[PDB]
Amino acid sequence: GLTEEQRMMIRELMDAQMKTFDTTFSHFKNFRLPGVLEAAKWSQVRKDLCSLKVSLQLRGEDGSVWNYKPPADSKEIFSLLPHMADMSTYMFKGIISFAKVISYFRDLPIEDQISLLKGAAFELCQLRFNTVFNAETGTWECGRLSYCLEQQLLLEPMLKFHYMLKKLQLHEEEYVLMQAISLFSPDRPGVLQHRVVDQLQEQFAITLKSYIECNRPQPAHRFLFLKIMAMLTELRSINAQHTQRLLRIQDIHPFATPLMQELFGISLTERHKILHRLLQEGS
Amino acid sequence: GLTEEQRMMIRELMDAQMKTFDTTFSHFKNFRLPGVLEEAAKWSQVRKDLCSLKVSLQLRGEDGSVWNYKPPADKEIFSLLPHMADMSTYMFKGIISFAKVISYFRDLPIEDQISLLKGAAFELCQLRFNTVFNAETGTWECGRLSYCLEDLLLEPMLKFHYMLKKLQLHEEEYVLMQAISLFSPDRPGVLQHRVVDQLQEQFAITLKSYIECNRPQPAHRFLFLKIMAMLTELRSINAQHTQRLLRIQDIHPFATPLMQELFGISLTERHKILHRLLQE
Ligand SMILES: CCC[C@H](CC)Oc1ccc(C(C)(C)C)cc1NC(=O)c1nnn(-c2cc(OC)ccc2OC)c1C
Ligand SMILES: CCC[C@H](CC)Oc1ccc(C(C)(C)C)cc1NC(=O)c1nnn(-c2cc(OC)ccc2OC)c1C
């Protein structure tokens, strides 16, 4: 059905996903939590966060449950950001390990490996979040941790993206191929090997198109490849929107972890020491 | 009305209660919380104890947020023990200060003060908890903290709080219950048996007189005897749960240093912490 390299290409991506995606978040610990007790600069920031209002649930090995309901909109809308920054950083660290396992990624120059991950970090993080997202309950089920949302919501692009993508009912192979196509974006800022990364991206897209033809005869999956490519384009647009929105919040309320600071621009390898160090460390 | 000495008795008890009862729990900080992670017959008795009064904890925040802790189901039954040990220790400190403000209590020998507090600590604590208990929601409202019961009256402690709240007692009747319970002449280790009994009788007479003077005559003709019956039932619950606490401590230590003295884990030589608090 698939060519020998296509079969090996999917097997490597699926193996990398298994080795680097902590779906139960069993190794996510020592994270911050909400404590137990210039007009437009502050207004426009709040206008977006209301759509992303979530309640946190922390289940334990003994069966107990901690549940955090967020405060209502009235500096109280930034109570969950230190936790989300710790969670995002943990997810990105798994994303970094995902790229290190891919052979086509290791052979790139070290600065291109930094540039590619810097542009696809948010996109690969939301793709993984979609696999743990529950469309019915509106909850991201992250093992011990759960994030439950609190029409006017779908107006937010990130929310509409997760519902549209979950509605496609993608296989694990299609998800990990989306991650590869997003990661190997030749037109990211700072990329040097534009041609090599572009050639790699094209082979992943062909492999995705071929895989869909071999496993989706159903009419519900008509034009699924073109739908996926459109979603990846939309996710890249959402990346630019949220990355700039995040910088505004950091400007008013510092919350980014040291690794997240490198991702935002707050020698290439000299200003990305943590990312450079993580790219040299092995699994 | 009441005699001037009876009025001064209530005025001093109310003054002590005002100075020593943090009704809003504003100073109850730095407490432990459940984390985010033959001996058979010993554990057999322990499980039967903890599963009787399982509660869920709620934490309202200054910003309006709410933390809520649901307990597990049947070494998992020990998750709320450190928090309650912190809560009981804080409550008893206010109980100790309550007795120190009473002049009739300071004039007692230091050993009798230890014996009385040792036997009335649990009873005076549940009486104070009853005033912050909501019968409708089944929740003890301790300011920022709330303890909600989990889906009862079969348990005596549970029916006690509902029956006592049903009486709708005044502040003066509550603080008189505390005095009658504190000045129990038949506590273990009490020496001044006659003096404490005479004091308890004066508190009881004052309580009976207060009810006759501030309540409708026929509707509350047995309200005093209802109160005495509740105090009798509460003293039985004391020995039952204090024995229950000794079992749990034997298998799983959780009691704070002050609680250890309260349980038996020279009367002043084995109650040095309690002795120090009575001196200051
Ligand atoms: C599915 C979306 C994720 C998350 C999981 C349930 O949903 C949220 C829920 C509630 C909230 C608030 C409003 C209550 C705080 C936020 C979020 N979402 C983030 O916290 C988030 N998601 N991705 N990133 C991110 C990561 C990055 O690389 C490390 C670079 C740039 C990034 O943002 C441009 C971040 C910071
Ligand atoms: C009814 C109101 C109390 C409390 C508030 C909701 O209900 C509980 C709920 C759950 C639990 C567990 C089972 C989950 C731990 C326990 C308790 N109850 C105690 O934690 C308690 N209440 N009083 N005392 C006490 C005090 C003392 O000196 C002041 C001496 C000996 C004492 O115990 C014999 C204690 C230790």
Numbering used by the authors:
A (entry chain B): 142 to 178, 195 to 231, 234 to 309, 316 to 431, 445 to 461
B (entry chain A): 142 to 178, 194 to 230, 234 to 310, 318 to 431, 445 to 459
Would you copy out the relevant sentences from the publication that reported this structure?
PXR is a nuclear receptor that can be activated by diverse compounds to elevate metabolism, negatively impacting drug efficacy and safety. As a xenobiotic sensor, PXR is activated by structurally diverse compounds and plays a major role in drug metabolism and drug-drug interactions by regulating transcription of genes encoding drug metabolizing enzymes, drug conjugating enzymes, and drug transporters. Here, we report structurally related PXR-selective agonists and antagonists and their corresponding co-crystal structures to describe mechanisms of antagonism and selectivity. Structural and computational approaches show that antagonists induce PXR conformational changes incompatible with transcriptional coactivator recruitment.
It should be noted that SJPYT-278 is a racemic mixture, where the (S) and (R) enantiomers were individually synthesized as SJPYT-312 and SJPYT-313, respectively. The electron density in PXR LBD complexed with the racemic SJPYT-278 mixture indicates the presence of both (R) and (S) enantiomers, likely because they have similar PXR LBD binding potency. The SJPYT-312 complex allowed visualization specifically of the (S) enantiomer. Agonistic and antagonistic activities were evaluated using a luciferase reporter under the control of a PXR-responsive CYP3A4 promoter, and as predicted, analogs with the 4-methoxy (SJPYT-326 and SJPYT-328) are agonists, and all compounds lacking the 4-methoxy (SJPYT-278, SJPYT-312, SJPYT-313, SJPYT-327, SJPYT-330, and SJPYT-331) are antagonists. Like SJPYT-310, region B of all analogs engages both the π-trap and the leucine cage, and the triazole moiety is hydrogen bonded with Q285. Like SJPYT-310, all compounds reposition F251 and the α12 residues L428 and F429. The antagonists SJPYT-312, SJPYT-331, and SJPYT-278 lack the region A 4-methoxy group and cannot effectively engage the α12 cleft. Furthermore, all antagonists consistently lose PXR L428 contact with the SRC-1 LXXLL residue L690, while the interaction is maintained by agonists. Therefore, we performed MD simulations of PXR LBD bound to agonists (SJPYT-326 and SJPYT-328) or antagonists (SJPYT-312 and SJPYT-331). While α12 of agonist-bound PXR LBD remains in the crystallographically determined inward active conformation, α12 of antagonist-bound PXR LBD moves outward to a position overlapping with the SRC-1 peptide binding site.
